[PDB]
Write a protein that binds this ligand. Structure first.
Ligand SMILES: O[C@@H]1[C@@H](O)[C@H](O[C@@H]2CO[C@@H](O[C@@H]3CO[C@@H](O[C@@H]4CO[C@@H](O)[C@H](O)[C@H]4O)[C@H](O)[C@H]3O)[C@H](O)[C@H]2O)OC[C@H]1O
Ligand SMILES: O[C@@H]1[C@@H](O)[C@H](O[C@@H]2CO[C@@H](O[C@@H]3CO[C@@H](O[C@@H]4CO[C@@H](O)[C@H](O)[C@H]4O)[C@H](O)[C@H]3O)[C@H](O)[C@H]2O)OC[C@H]1O
Length: 507
């Protein structure tokens, strides 16, 4: 709460000496400190949840007030219940001179400031034998749950990994290796990791024949130290920000381009085989378009264009990855293929073609970037079953569940902001439904794992993707842990599914 400094302020006398009101300017709110108990205040409407809230004021006091040796008391009290309040803050003349920052934590014995009955009067007053003036420049007021899950990974009903995507050197704030809160949540709940960006193409090979393994190797070493396996992401992907410059600008033949693509794959696969912890790769990521009917991408993919207007690079990537390490599990990975419409159909036809022509492929990764109420559990189940029936592994690679999403629930007509308890419980049921559909649809020996695309809501990729539609607000809140790394009901819902407990949006 940033308190308005231009409206809503009042003089106050909490003692016998009368006050002389308040004065507005460009510097803030000013009053004369006429006697003991004389101050300035504003109101907060009922109901209030103000226990453990922190009041911070920037103030500025006159020479005469300094000379008076008077103290300053930040306080709050209930209107019509005047005797009840927070009276234990005091800034003594000692500490005063400049704009100072004075704070007051609202901390009461009986929880009196979590209440429904009265409005709340908040302010600052002089104590002692005061004189001169006080100026307040600004006021800010900084206002748990447990899922009771000890280790999420330990609840899987068969042997499949429970995994998470982490940030690395691509984020100063959220880098797994420098952020001890990220390390803690990961070590507590997961046994499987994906790098969010640093194993993508231009990160691994920024120029032709100069590979850069240093940062990704430190990530793999930390996974090994902590008894976790690594899913490699990704050997081939069209997204412009991570295509190596020399590939974007290829000026030679189609056969020479495909040979350079082979070198990229063989070098990276051989290196991570020898490092000793790399169990599966997304070999080709998101190569099908978003049209209906669906086709492989054309002009928006450097790989289609530089291969000579051909999708042959897809099968070649799989053949090359297999030759480099025959033991590593090979996935095709994509979004929207869980919807059971045009894109699902194109993916299934591609797998059938590959099986007919002896092109190696071990599984399909369903990224599973879903909305709260779309697509349906029936459609998600039917789409995964199409892959199960071809004898392949099914892996959920990038699960998140958006509370607001511009393509769902007629956004923004029903926008949820701020986040509510009802929305958190809806998210609990939704994570339960999706994980249960996976277990119900995919036989034990075809379960490639379930991973979520991030740790805390404070760093989800969705808020950046939809920044324009969201008006720069962080409103997708799509993951298992909140902005302070505490549990959300979402985590209880994931756990309920693993243990076979009914999926609900209740407590
Ligand atoms: O250290 C604590 C003491 O400060 C504390 O004294 C209390 C201070 O607050 C007092 O409440 C006064 C009551 O008058 C209010 O103004 C009235 C608002 O309504 C108008 O209709 C009316 O005309 C005004 O006069 C004022 O806002 C408010 O500060 C309270 O009565 C004192 O008990 O005691 C506890 C110590 O720990
Ligand atoms: O020089 C800096 C640039 O490098 C930097 O680039 C940004 C890097 O982050 C990018 O966002 C990435 C995009 O990929 C996300 O994961 C994908 C989600 O969709 C799935 O289909 C796919 O499989 C996943 O790989 C990832 O979470 C997210 O962090 C962003 O788009 C780039 O612009 O910009 C800052 C410069 O200083």
């Amino acid at each position: 709460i940033e308190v308005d400094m231009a409206n809503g302020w009042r003089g106050n006398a909490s003692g016998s000496t009368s006050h002389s009101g308040i004065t507005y300017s460009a510097d803030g709110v000013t009053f004369a400190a006429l006697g003991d108990g004389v101050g300035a205040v504003f109101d907060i409407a009922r109901p209030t949840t103000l226990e453990d809230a922190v009041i911070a004021m920037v103030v500025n006091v006159s020479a005469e007030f300094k000379a008076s040796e008077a103290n300053l008391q930040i306080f709050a009290q209930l209107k019509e219940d005047w005797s009840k309040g927070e009276w234990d803050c005091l800034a003594a003349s000692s500490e005063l001179t400049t704009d100072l920052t004075l704070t007051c934590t609202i901390d009461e014995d009986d929880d009196k400031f979590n209440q429904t009955a009265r409005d709340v009067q908040v302010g600052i007053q002089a104590k002692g034998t005061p004189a001169g003036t006080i100026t307040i420049k600004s006021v800010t007021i900084t206002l748990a749950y447990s899922a009771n899950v000890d280790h999420l990974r330990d609840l899987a009903p068969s042997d499949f990994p429970i995994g998470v995507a982490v940030s690395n050197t691509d984020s100063a704030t959220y880098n797994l290796l420098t952020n001890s809160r990220e390390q803690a949540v990961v070590k507590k709940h997961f046994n499987h990791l994906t790098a969010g960006n640093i194993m993508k193409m231009s990160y691994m090979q920024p120029t032709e024949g100069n590979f850069n393994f240093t940062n990704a190797d430190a990530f793999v070493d930390w996974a090994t130290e902590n008894n976790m396996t690594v899913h490699g992401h990704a050997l081939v992907w069209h997204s412009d920000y991570q295509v190596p410059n020399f590939m974007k600008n290829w000026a030679g033949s189609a056969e020479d381009f495909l040979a350079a693509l082979d070198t990229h794959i063989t070098t990276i696969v051989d290196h991570y085989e020898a490092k000793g912890n790399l169990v599966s790769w997304d070999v080709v990521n998101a190569a099908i378009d978003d049209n209906s009917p669906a086709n492989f991408r054309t002009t928006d993919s450097a790989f289609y264009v530089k291969s000579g207007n051909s999708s042959v690079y897809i099968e070649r990537a799989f053949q090359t990855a297999r030759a480099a390490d025959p033991a590593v599990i090979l996935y095709y990975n994509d979004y929207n293929i869980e919807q059971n419409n045009a894109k699902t159909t194109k993916m299934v036809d591609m797998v059938k073609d590959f099986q007919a022509r002896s092109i190696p492929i071990d599984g399909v990764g369903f990224q599973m970037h879903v909305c709260m109420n779309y697509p349906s559990i029936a459609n998600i189940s039917a789409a995964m079953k199409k892959v199960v029936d071809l004898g392949l592994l099914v892996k959920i690679t990038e699960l998140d569940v958006a509370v607001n999403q511009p393509h769902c629930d007629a956004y923004p007509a029903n926008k949820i902001n701020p986040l509510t308890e009802a929305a958190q419980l809806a998210q609990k049921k939704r994570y339960c439904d999706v994980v249960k559909a996976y277990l119900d649809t995919v036989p034990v020996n075809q379960r490639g794992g379930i991973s979520v695309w991030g740790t805390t809501d404070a760093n989800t990729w969705l808020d950046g993707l939809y920044r324009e539609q969201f008006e720069d607000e962080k409103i997708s809140w799509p993951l298992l842990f909140d902005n302070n790394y505490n549990d959300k009901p979402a985590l209880r819902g994931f756990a309920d599914a693993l243990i076979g407990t009914q999926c609900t949006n209740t407590h």
